[PDB]
């Protein structure tokens, strides 16, 4: 996907309003300048130039009258998703690295981010548990058949919950952010 | 790059102001909703979902008090650049398909779009002419060494012109739009 000293970035805004984003390198140099709407970007990506094979990037985010500074390390030739979320009376971000594995024909791949205060089990297969840790825990990737998943079985941990995933397309990898079960759907590059 | 019934799109705005873009499918269905600044997007891309392996997409563009409608055909698993340009007292767009060839280590790849009213020869190699037809003609791709090209030899067709390309990075493919020689630099996904 990305060339030497380059990365791909997808910005995911889970805040209740627009978020202004900049990403700086080591010398007050903007690698990305982006305005992101609430519950965007599901299918928009940017290419960032690094100064080395590895770097700590400076993510500056404006939300209302706040301008936060969050640092996250990256490695060349990788794709990342920056998840922006409301953190108390402020905002914070988490950076997740995406997989380079292409689903087999007839399959799609899915992953979860759990924002709730309780650990979740996504029960797609009963002989293959899919754990999603509380407070922004990230699940392992899982390959599934392409198709519609309107009522997926979800446990926490003596409680049962249903989750709608919508239509999953052939050869596509999805990220589901569990918000309330309710989940926001984004697509990996 | 893109999965079955998907494309990548990069929007290149050569107009003097912001351009609002929508791209529709066959049933008043938005595949992309984008606001693009003047001389952007050099490194931002979107994924579009097609309804078939091939489709004619409806590109709607707003520039000041104009809302134009331009149709361009696409094929699945391809990457495209939409070049928006001022066309008299209006705007128009052209869609170009990008190559899937990765430059060898130590190399970069480049391509030209000539907006001038005269045919151009980009003389990088004297034994390998690089023609760029007038009135938005597209040149063939050319692999070159990574490095700085501040004064490239450019002919039209008994006249000599110099062109600055800046720094070309390892493994990257570039699009140069010749505007006035003066050229705007964009990067293929
Ligand atoms: Cs975008
Ligand atoms: Cs920092
Ligand atoms: Cs963007
Ligand atoms: Cs149309």
Author numbering:
A (entry chain A), B (entry chain A): 408 to 587, 593 to 601
Copy out sentences from the published article reporting this entry, exactly as the authors wrote them.
Here, we present the crystal structure of the extracellular domain from both PepT1 and PepT2 that reveal two immunoglobulin-like folds connected in tandem, providing structural insight into mammalian peptide transport.
Following extensive screening, crystals from Rattus norvegicus PepT2, residues 410–601, were also obtained. The final structure refined to a resolution of 2.06 Å with final Rwork and Rfree of 19.9% and 24.0%, respectively. The crystallographic asymmetric unit of the PepT1ECD crystal contained two monomers that formed a head-to-tail dimer, related by a two-fold non-crystallographic symmetry axis, whereas the PepT2ECD construct was crystallized in a monomeric state. The crystal structures revealed that in the PepT1ECD there exist two conserved salt bridge interactions stabilizing the interface between lobe 1 and lobe 2, mediated by Asp574-Lys398 and Asp476-Arg490, whereas in PepT2ECD only one equivalent salt bridge interaction is present, between Asp505 and Arg538. We identified two highly conserved charged residues, Asp550 and Glu573 in PepT1ECD and Asp576 and Glu599 in PepT2ECD, located on one face of the ECD structure.
